[PDB]
């Protein structure tokens, strides 16, 4: 388990430390690719195919948990087989950039990010479902224990193995940076490796974004059900009534979080707040319901009609100042959990305002 | 079997992966330091008790704010790392990692770890940090951050020497059992 030992034992002396190190990293890449493929085939054989064959769950559920596994496996197997081909021409691997570009650039990039994103985007939700299922269904809990007892699982659970694809993608840039580091500069090789490294980052950003939007969408549907915008079915101040039929489902979420509202000088209101693309929405938790409600102060703010200001004496607090001539003469004074949180909330608030 | 899940978090420069490797192998790797540490179960005994400690690396996830949370569920103990040769990594403890970990792992114990302690007194290091006008982190600063963030404990180690490594994990495991 290590290139200088193993292969390249009589062939080591010939080489520089840099070229030894280059070989090691390339070897790690190859060996951990095959290893990753192994893990996917464990998912296939121990879990997916058995769940399917023995009807452990409705096919509609199973497809959400394992959307495109055979495709995922072939993405990696094909690449793996090209690695084998290249190792065939001797244990000292020469140029590698084209093999990297064949997985991470152009069409091959589009394919990998689509397939990886479809496999991962919904995964946190499917796993929560599986967890529920295990609690509630004895046949299912039993099957999961039996499957996880298989030695191929290496004592891990399904939730610990199914995340391997996301984790594998995060390693490629790091493995490329280290190869690049041990590659002679001024080379086309070197340039093309940098290109591959950069495209891997872009692939991670794409999968990051898919998970974000898929989870956010599911989260906002759940919130919508629990939304009660009833006290705005009437109105007090004019500027609240237009959000009586506020539908969270039709907007994008940027951020969310608890904030304390300093409404007067010795009154506070504990809020949960959504930062959407166009609106900041202030909600009160009330059992399991999310109350959209005045105080008067409006509970919805339009980001195109506000300014954001720090508070010099309170590193956890920030102001929102409504700029409509119909606005309140009062500022919304909001308090975050920490100074860090307040930095985050402000950075994102200012950005969203610039784009509103 | 008592099964616990440990997740290691901190800045990308701070030696997360390598720390997991020496704990798991009881050996600093001589000729080559791997970039990849796969999810893996380690056996460890602490206080009489046998424990299976599922080890999760997060290296490479530091720029991807919606990939990271995927490792968090069912975590039993968090190892939060900075590196003693990087006070920048230390300042991200309260600035980045602590709020994230408290949000996604409420009530999960945290152990703060200062890696690379062998460098507190390496001169190449002292001088480099001279330039940006800094110096190696000191145990008192480490320790104060630990109380600041509500950590269950503070620990320093050096992966290169293996010094304090076992002790890091033993502490993390005790925290998982409480
Ligand atoms: C490349 C070897 N290395 C290291 C450095 C930065 C990051 C990493 C692991 C990457 C990560 O997991 O964030 C390992 C270490 C790891 C531990 C060290 C302890 C003392 C002195 C130097 C050390 N170097």
Give the per-residue SS3 of chain B.
CEEEEEEEEECCCCCHHHHHHHHHHCCCCCCCCCCCCCCEEEEEEECCEEEEEEEECCCCCCCCCCCHHHHCCCCCEEEEEEECCEHHHHHHHHHHHHHHHHHHCCCCCEEEEEECHHHCCCHHHHHHHHHCCCCCCCHHHHHHHHHHHCCCEEEECCCCCCCCHHHHHHHHHHHHHC
Contact A304, A316 (CB under 8 A): no
Nearest one of A251, A273, A252 to A318, comparing CA atoms: A273
What is the structure's resolution, reported in angstroms to one decimal? 2.3
Nearest one of B57, B112, B61, B109 to B90, comparing CA atoms: B112
Nearest one of A199, A48, A211, A201 to A120, comparing CA atoms: A211
Residue nearest to atom 15 of ligand 1 (CA): B15
* Among A residues 183-222, those touching chain B with beta carbons less than 8 Å apart: 201, 204-205, 207-209, 211-212, 215
Which residue range forms the structural domain that includes residue B24? 1-178
Task: State whether B41 and A154 contact (CB < 8 Å).
Answer: yes
CA–CA distances in Å: residue B43 to residues B51, B54, B166 = 6, 9, 12
Contact A65, A130 (CB under 8 A): yes
Cα–Cα dist A275/A301, whole Å:
10
* Neighbouring C-beta atoms of residue A274, cutoff 10 Å: 22
Contact A279, A302 (CB under 8 A): yes
Cα–Cα dist A164/A37, whole Å:
10
Cα–Cα dist B171/B176, whole Å:
9
Cα–Cα dist B86/A43, whole Å:
40
Cα–Cα dist A322/A290, whole Å:
23
Rounded to 5 degrees, φ, ψ at B59 are -50, 125
Cα–Cα dist B94/B149, whole Å:
7
Residue owning tokens 């330039």: B131
Contact A159, A127 (CB under 8 A): yes
* Neighbouring C-beta atoms of residue A81, cutoff 10 Å: 11
Range A233-248 burial, b when 16+ CB lie within 10 A, else e:
eeeeeebbeebeebeb
Q: How many A×B Cβ pairs under 8 Å?
A: 90
Residue owning tokens 């400690």: B53
What is the SS3 string spanning A255-290? EEEEEEEECCCCCEEEEEEEEECCEEEEEEEECCEE
How determined? X-ray
What's the angle, vertex CA B23, arms to CA B21 and CA B25, rounded to 5? 65
Cα–Cα dist A318/A346, whole Å:
8
Check which CATH number belongs to the domain holding B69 and give it: 3.40.50.300
Range B128-161 burial, b when 16+ CB lie within 10 A, else e:
ebeeeeeebbeeeebbebbeebebbbbbbbbbbe
| Interface probe with B: pick from A170, A202, A336, most Cβ of B within 10 Å | A170
Rounded to 5 degrees, φ, ψ at B176 are -65, -35
Contact B176, B31 (CB under 8 A): no
Cα–Cα dist B165/B155, whole Å:
9
Nearest one of A112, A119, A104 to A210, comparing CA atoms: A119
Q: At what angle do helices A188-226 and A106-120 cross, to 10 degrees?
A: 30
Contact A353, A301 (CB under 8 A): no
Cα–Cα dist A331/B51, whole Å:
54
Q: Can you list the domains of chain A with their CATH numbers?
A: 1-229 (1.20.900.10), 230-356 (2.30.29.30)
- Show Cβ contacts of residue A332 under 8 Å, excluding neighbours closer than 6 positions: A261, A297, A301, A319, A320, A321, A322
Query: In terms of C-beta density within 10 A (0-12 exposed, 13-18 middle, 19 or more buried), how is residue A266 classed?
Result: exposed
- Show Cβ contacts of residue A184 under 8 Å, excluding neighbours closer than 6 positions: A18, A190
Query: In terms of C-beta density within 10 A (0-12 exposed, 13-18 middle, 19 or more buried), how is residue A89 classed?
Result: exposed
* Neighbouring C-beta atoms of residue A18, cutoff 10 Å: 12
CA–CA distances in Å: residue A139 to residues A56, A60, A180 = 8, 19, 51
- Show Cβ contacts of residue A171 under 8 Å, excluding neighbours closer than 6 positions: A32, B35, B36, B59, B60
Sign for the pseudo-dihedral over CA of A19, A22, A26, A28: positive
Cα–Cα dist B44/B18, whole Å:
18
Nearest one of A240, A251, A185 to A217, comparing CA atoms: A251
Contact B14, B154 (CB under 8 A): no
Cα–Cα dist A230/A221, whole Å:
18
Residues with CB under 6 A from ligand 1: B 12-18, 33, 59, 116, 118-119, 158-160
Q: At what angle do helices A188-226 and A123-136 cross, to 10 degrees?
A: 50
Which two three-digit tokens encode residue A225?
Answer: 């059900």
Pairing of strands B2-10, A332-335: unpaired
Contact B70, B21 (CB under 8 A): no
Cα–Cα dist A25/A176, whole Å:
9
Rounded to an integer, what is the distance from CA B130 to the centroid of its chain?
25
Cα–Cα dist A50/A46, whole Å:
6
> Given ligand 1 and candidates B7, B8, B15, which is best to mutate, with the most ligand atoms within 8 Å of its CB?
B15
CA–CA distances in Å: residue B115 to residues A248, B55, B81 = 44, 17, 7
Which two three-digit tokens encode residue A319?
Answer: 């102001």
Nearest one of B49, B81, B39, B44 to B178, comparing CA atoms: B49
Cα–Cα dist A85/A108, whole Å:
18
Domain count, chain B: 1
Contact B81, B113 (CB under 8 A): yes
Cα–Cα dist A171/B136, whole Å:
29
Chain B residues at the A interface, defined by Cβ less than 8 Å, are 31-32, 34-36, 38-41, 52, 54, 56-57, 59-61, 63-67, 69-71, 73-74, 94-96, 98-99
A201 contacts in B (CB within 8 Å)? 63
Taking every pair of C-alpha atoms in chain A, what is the biggest distance, in angstroms? 86
What is the SS3 string spanning chain A? CCCCCCCCCCCCCCCCHHHHHHHHHHHHHHHHHHHHHHHHHHHHHHHHHHHHHCCCCCHHHHHHHCCCHHHHHHHHHHHHHHHHHHHHCCCCCCCCHHHHHHHHCHHHHHHHHHHHHHHHCCHHHHHHHHHHHHHHCHHHHHHHHHHHHCHHHCCCCHHHHCCHHHHHHHHHHHHHHHHHHCCCCCCHHHHHHHHHHHHHHHHHHHHHHHHHHHHHHHHHHHHHHHEECCCCCCCCCHHHHHHCCCCHHHCCEEEEEEEEEECCCCCEEEEEEEEECCEEEEEEEECCEEECCCCCCCCEEEHHHEEEEECCCCCCEEEEEECCCCCCCCCEEEECCCHHHHHHHHHHHHHHHHHC
Contact A298, A239 (CB under 8 A): yes
Rounded to an integer, what is the distance from CA A200 to the centroid of its chain?
15
What spacing in Å lies between the alpha carbon of B15 and ligand 1's midpoint? 4
What spacing in Å lies between the alpha carbon of A73 and ligand 1's midpoint? 32
Contact A306, A352 (CB under 8 A): no
Write the Ramachandran bin of A186: left for phi over 0, alpha for psi from -120 to 50, otherwise beta: left
Cα–Cα dist A319/A311, whole Å:
7
């Amino acid at each position: 388990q290590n290139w200088q030992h193993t292969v390249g034992k009589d062939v080591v002396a010939g080489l520089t430390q840099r070229e030894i190190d280059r070989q090691e990293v390339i070897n790690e890449l190859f060996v951990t690719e095959a290893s990753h493929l192994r893990t996917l085939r464990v998912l296939d054989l121990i879990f997916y195919q058995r769940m399917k064959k023995e009807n452990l769950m409705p096919r509609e559920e199973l497809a959400r948990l394992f959307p495109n596994l055979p495709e995922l496996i072939e993405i990696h197997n094909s690449w793996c087989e090209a690695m084998k081909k290249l190792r065939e021409e001797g244990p000292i691997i020469k140029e590698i950039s084209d093999l990297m570009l064949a997985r991470f650039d152009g069409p091959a990039r589009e394919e990998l990010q689509q397939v990886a994103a479809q496999f991962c985007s919904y995964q946190s939700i499917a796993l929560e479902l599986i967890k529920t299922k295990q609690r509630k269904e004895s046949r299912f809990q039993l099957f999961m224990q039996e499957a996880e007892s298989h030695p191929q699982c290496r004592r891990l659970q399904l939730r610990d193995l199914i995340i391997s694809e996301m984790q594998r993608l995060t390693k490629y840039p790091l493995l490329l940076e280290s190869i690049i580091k041990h590659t002679e500069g001024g080379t086309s090789e070197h340039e093309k490796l940098c290109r591959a490294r950069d495209q891997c980052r872009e692939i991670l950003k794409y999968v990051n974004e898919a998970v974000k939007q898929t989870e956010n969408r599911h989260r906002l549907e759940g919130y919508q059900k629990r939304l009660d915008a009833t006290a705005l079915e009437r109105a007090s101040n004019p500027l609240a009534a237009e959000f009586k039929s506020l539908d969270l489902t039709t907007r994008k979420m940027i951020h969310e979080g608890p904030l304390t509202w300093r409404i007067s000088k010795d009154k506070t209101l504990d809020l949960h707040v959504l930062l959407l693309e166009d609106l900041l929405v202030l909600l009160q938790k009330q059992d399991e319901k999310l109350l959209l409600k005045c105080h008067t102060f409006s509970p919805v703010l339009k980001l195109n009609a506000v300014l954001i200001r720090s508070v010099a004496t309170d590193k956890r607090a920030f102001f929102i100042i409504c700029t409509s001539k119909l606005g309140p003469p009062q500022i919304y004074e909001l308090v975050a959990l920490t100074s860090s949180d307040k930095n985050t909330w402000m950075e994102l608030l200012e950005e969203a305002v610039r784009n509103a | 079997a008592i099964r616990k899940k440990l997740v290691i978090v901190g800045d990308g420069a701070c030696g997360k992966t390598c720390l997991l490797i020496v704990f798991s192998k009881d050996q600093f790797p001589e000729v080559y330091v791997p970039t990849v540490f796969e999810n893996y179960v380690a056996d460890i005994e602490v206080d009489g008790k046998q424990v299976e400690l599922a080890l999760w690396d997060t290296a490479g996830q530091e720029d991807y704010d919606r990939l990271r949370p995927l490792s968090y569920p069912d975590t039993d103990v968090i190892l939060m790392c900075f590196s003693i040769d990087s006070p920048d990594s230390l300042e991200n403890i309260p600035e980045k990692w602590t709020p994230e970990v408290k949000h996604f792992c409420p009530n999960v114990p945290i152990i703060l770890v200062g890696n690379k302690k062998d460098l507190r007194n390496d001169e190449h290091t002292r001088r480099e940090l001279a330039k940006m006008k800094q110096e190696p982190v000191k145990p008192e600063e480490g320790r104060d951050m630990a109380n600041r963030i509500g950590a269950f404990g503070y620990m320093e180690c050096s992966a290169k020497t293996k010094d304090g490594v076992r002790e890091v994990f033993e502490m993390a495991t005790r925290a998982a059992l409480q």
